[PDB]
Design a protein around this ligand. Structure first.
Ligand SMILES: CCCCCCCCCCCCCCCC(=O)O
Ligand SMILES: CCCCCCCCCCCCCC(=O)O
Ligand SMILES: [Cl-]
Ligand SMILES: [Zn+2]
Ligand SMILES: [Zn+2]
Length: 266
């Protein structure tokens, strides 16, 4: 595939799920070889693993005193559409959560793609690798196409379920929303996070119920979202990725761990 950017600048605004503050981003086109980078208060923050500063409840990046929380959804959409050269100006300290999925990002960007004059140099997983953390595990192996499987084991009605993404099925995960278990909301609030969360941007699940009146978009929306999250974190490798991944109860922390190990080996 050819490197790509946007035909014209695109903007999105709303509240940050964690800061609860107003935030906006403006995606500006860039020439070939530029890569993906954020811009905040005068500083450019490359969308790469070296700049990750936090991974609990979101993937946050930072450089020279400037931080941007929750980049996983916008990066996932960019990765899925193979947008390789753009500057994402950010107003605020976090990417707007919108409806909790990548839908708005996806539909807007997909309609404004601009192919460029340069072949994409994909990050190709060369050899099998596995990272673990108290039961949680992620395995990556060679593959000509990006394939991502997530298997969860939930302590509620969801039980054990899995979902596999394969190239071409982007629409099957870009609508999956951010979720959250009622028994964990106090903690999230207590650690200074989740200030902008609401039934409008997050699926709240109980031991045996779904609080949102709209219910789940798919019986397995949570695992679909996890796949969506992992795909965004994988883009932190600096280039579109080709490989087969299997995540069992993985989260941002483990996702970034895998990314750093892959980058290290290669
Ligand atoms: C670990 C990942 C997730 C990010 C989740 C942040 C969102 C915080 C939750 C806010 C929802 C509050 C809803 C009130 C509780 C209720 O109705 O039972
Ligand atoms: C179903 C749409 C209704 C809006 C969703 C209701 C959830 C909002 C409650 C959290 C907002 C309060 C933030 C705070 O804790 O100060
Ligand atoms: Cl925490
Ligand atoms: Zn926590
Ligand atoms: Zn997410």
């Amino acid at each position: 595939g050819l490197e790509k950017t946007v035909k014209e600048k695109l903007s999105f605004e709303g509240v940050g799920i964690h800061t609860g503050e107003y935030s906006k981003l403006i995606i500006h086109p860039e020439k070939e070889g530029t890569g993906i980078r954020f811009f905040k208060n005068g500083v450019y923050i490359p969308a790469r693993h070296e700049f990750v500063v936090h991974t609990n409840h979101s993937t946050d990046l930072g450089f020279k005193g400037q931080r941007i929380k929750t980049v996983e959804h916008i990066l996932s959409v960019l990765h899925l559409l193979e947008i390789t050269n753009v500057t994402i100006e950010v107003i605020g300290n976090e990417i707007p959560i919108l409806d909790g999925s990548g839908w708005e990002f996806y539909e807007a960007i997909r309609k404004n793609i601009l192919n460029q004059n340069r072949e994409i140099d994909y990050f190709v997983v060369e050899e099998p690798i596995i990272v673990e953390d108290e039961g949680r595990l992620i395995k990556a192996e060679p593959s000509d196409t990006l394939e991502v499987t997530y298997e969860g084991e939930f302590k509620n009605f969801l039980g054990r379920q899995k979902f596999t993404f394969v190239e071409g099925n982007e629409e099957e995960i870009v609508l999956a929303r951010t979720f959250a278990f009622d028994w964990e909301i106090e903690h999230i609030k207590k650690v200074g996070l989740g200030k902008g969360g609401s039934l409008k941007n997050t699926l709240v699940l109980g031991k045996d119920k779904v609080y949102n009146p709209e219910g789940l978009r798919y019986e397995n929306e949570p695992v679909r979202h996890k796949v969506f999250d992992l795909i965004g974190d994988l883009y932190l490798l600096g280039s579109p990725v080709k490989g087969k991944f299997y995540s069992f109860r993985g989260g941002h922390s483990l996702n970034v761990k895998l990314v750093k190990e892959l980058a290290k080996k290669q």
